[PDB]
Amino acid sequence: VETWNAAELVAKDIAHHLHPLTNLYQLRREGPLVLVRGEGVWVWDAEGKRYLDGFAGLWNVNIGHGRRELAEAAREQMERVAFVPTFFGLASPPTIELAARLAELFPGPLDHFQFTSGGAESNETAIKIARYYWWLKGQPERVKILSRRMAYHGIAALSATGVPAYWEGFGPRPPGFIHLTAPYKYRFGEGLTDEEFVARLVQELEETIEREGSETIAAFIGEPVQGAGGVVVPPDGYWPAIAAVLRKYGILLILDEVITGFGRTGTLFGMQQYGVQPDIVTFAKGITSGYVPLGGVGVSDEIAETLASADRVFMHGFTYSGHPVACAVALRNLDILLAERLWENAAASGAYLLQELKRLEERPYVGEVRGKGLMLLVEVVRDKASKEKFPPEFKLGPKLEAATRRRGIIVRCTPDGIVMAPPLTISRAECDVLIEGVAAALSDVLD
Amino acid sequence: ETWNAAELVAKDIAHHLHPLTNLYQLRREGPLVLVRGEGVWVWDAEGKRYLDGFAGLWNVNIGHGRRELAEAAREQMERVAFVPTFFGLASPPTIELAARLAELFPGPLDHFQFTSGGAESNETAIKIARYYWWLKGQPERVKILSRRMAYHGIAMGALSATGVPAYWEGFGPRPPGFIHLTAPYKYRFGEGLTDEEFVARLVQELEETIEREGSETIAAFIGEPVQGAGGVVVPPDGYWPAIAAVLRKYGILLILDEVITGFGRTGTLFGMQQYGVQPDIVTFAKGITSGYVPLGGVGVSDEIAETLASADRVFMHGFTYSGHPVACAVALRNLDILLAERLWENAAASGAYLLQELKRLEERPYVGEVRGKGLMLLVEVVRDKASKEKFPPEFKLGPKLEAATRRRGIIVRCTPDGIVMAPPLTISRAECDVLIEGVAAALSDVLD
Ligand SMILES: Cc1ncc(COP(=O)(O)O)c(CN)c1O
């Protein structure tokens, strides 16, 4: 039985750990939450308190914590050999097998893959591949990237990301990015049917393409369901119409499946959910269930043939691309995910969670409860009629974070509300634990 | 395992979009599939043995086959595989690694944010420098000073920081605010000069560039102690103290890129110790885990961290796998082995021996210069010593040298400029002789 020195860990963390995505000022005064153990959907802190991992780490622990199978896979590969580069025509067996398996799993001619270590690396690779593809085609001015407001594609991709809070204070951003409106009906589609809202979004896309010039737009990048931006579930028919416009102008479609991928939405990939076939797909997170950092980009046969038609070295790559340990762990994780058909439980548990959490809509401070599969959000507002958010001085995010953690729940708490992305294995009883914790924390903060 | 070599080659050609590879050549010839490693040795799918003369990608410092790191990874994965460092969360291995790095990195370099790679680390450092100046009320201080032949990654601002134009070509526009200085490359840029005169010229160029741009607009200077991917450019004696003195004179932050040099490659634990420099920000990757698990990081001084922590706001930057518990645990075990075996010492000794033996190759008419620091070594190939002319692209010196070296059982970086070697810090005298003989034989095969 492992024993931790919580005070020592807190002191060392405050002294030496520059947390990402954290209020460092608050961290120095209050300290971190140190998690030391995990099983399934449960985690334990250094003091022995139990929490439900309602966010699956960072949308990524899809098959749950404590899977010995993945640990043994990593151990076996590391003992055999830990690192073989994919540079200079080198490769390891797990990397090759993962590439072939992903060619099978991703529908259609999405058959060529280059691996990375994260979602931001993957999106950066996809953008560069689109621009390089048009460059090889003799269209060097076709570099502009279409993205959306509230989109999140990484902080390295940072320009593609549509949340402005990530930009402030970090200096200039790479140019060539055009931001469209997010298919966010609650605030942008008031008093509209789904059809009319989709029509307006399509009109905006057409007008933007006309304004910029279709020959200057390399690609469109987007998530099937936007995740970090605020769990924006698109209206019915949005993706087919948007993809049709893009195909009309020849603009490449980059589908960001970093969060939606590998079973979160109720299917293996969100593209299946929305009947879209992208030219480029990006993935990360759930591919390994977060056990080892892994990401990747998959491209169509046409794009790959264009890239492979040049008798020159492809001048792009990250050092750990195709890491053998990551790929072996990914193969085992895919074995478990497919064998247990987790996307089915994701669909069922997500529907149950959405149904129960929608009861929170009765409360005066709950504007909207929305979700797709296991991606769920409770948007908190000061007033339902106006839809006005709580002001920054109220510190809704920190208060909700503290309340949820005190009630043994770990969920993303933001100024806009509560975001839940539990592991795909969550049972109904664990779903009830999450529901009651979220409701009680909301009552604690807002009555 | 149930793999056959031919099936692996076919599947790789069909489905693997290799990075840093001639895809046209790959489709015709297929990949070199490595399946097993121990120490400095690797084996391909057909059972042929090779010396890992590049340590993968400058990163397998303690060598292949260390069961201790595998056991650390297994233990951590069973206990908990992923705990985010976002939202004030952390795991014990991440915290312990941060404290240990605070001890190991000299001076007030005591605050760390982890990443999964070198490019992530350099992007984090650039953003941290700009954000630091922004918090200080200097939003116009965003320009980043870099050098020709510098390599800091191919993503995000790192791509701009990199000074090799071949990486830029065809990928579209890059983030603005990067200024490129001349590389301290004496062999071609400091001809007929002493080290002192060359350093004086470089200092003059840096000062005049700062004056032109305006020091108040320059957030930081980023550079490697020894440039690695750019061509193993060993700086002249006294270069780093003078450059750092100028930077401090204007208040410009110094970002030292220790992704390659870090963790014992140069003969000391970090390259900053070799060249007597104290950076405000340091970036690291590769050797920290010996490549066993993807890990990188950024370390900042107490002043920068205090400035960042003085703002009552969320720090809106981070990569998902920052501080991965398995990576940090493997890093702790790797550091245990590196410190206990004092690998920097063997790096210094073996590097000196390799440089001494390889410098003999300078007797050949096609070897322009052999240079190295620690275990970083390069043989620059030229058509003629007097002319110093590079072989033209049509000769395909890089591919020919690659094929020749692989045929002779050695894996080394072969480029149009020559041969680059970055062997595991554990390389012995006999393995060094194997590497030397293989390189000489490969050079004779291609150029006689
Ligand atoms: C000094 C340096 N910094 C950064 C990088 C990029 O690292 P990564 O591929 O992990 O992003 C490299 C690549 N070898 C490097 O040599």
Residue numbers in the entry:
A (entry chain A): 3 to 158, 161 to 451
B (entry chain B): 4 to 451
Recite the paper's sentences.
Transaminases reversibly catalyze the transfer reaction of an amino group from an amine donor to a carbonyl acceptor, mediated by pyridoxal 5′-phosphate (PLP) as a cofactor. Based on the sequence information of Vf-ωTA, a novel thermostable (S)-specific transaminase from Thermomicrobium roseum (Tr-ωTA) was also identified that exhibits diverse substrate specificity and thermostability. Herein, we report the crystal structure of Tr-ωTA at 1.8 Å resolution to clarify the substrate recognition mechanism of (S)-enantioselective Tr-ωTA. The overall structure constitutes a homodimer, with each subunit comprising a large and a small domain.
The structure of Tr-ωTA was determined in the PMP-bound form at 1.8 Å resolution. In the crystal structure of Tr-ωTA, the cofactor molecule did not link to either the Lys289 residue or a possible substrate, suggesting that the cofactor was PMP. In our structure, PMP was observed only in subunit B. This finding raised the possibility that conformational differences might exist between the two subunits of Tr-ωTA. As a result, although the PMP molecules were discriminatorily distributed between the subunits in the crystal, this did not cause any structural differences in the dimer form. As PMP is present only in subunit B in the crystal structure, our crystal therefore likely constituted a mixture of the apo and holo forms of Tr-ωTA. Specifically, the oxygen atoms in the phosphate group of PMP are coordinated to adjacent water molecules and residues such as Gly121, Ala122, and Thr323. The nitrogen atom on the PMP ring forms a hydrogen bond with Asp260. Notably, Thr323 and Tyr324 from the other subunit contribute to the stabilization of the PMP position. For Tr-ωTA, Y154 along with L23 and F89 from the other subunit constitute the P-pocket components, whereas W61 and I263 are involved in the formation of the O-pocket. In contrast, the loop covering the active site of Tr-ωTA exhibited high B-factor values, suggesting that this loop likely manifests intrinsic flexibility.
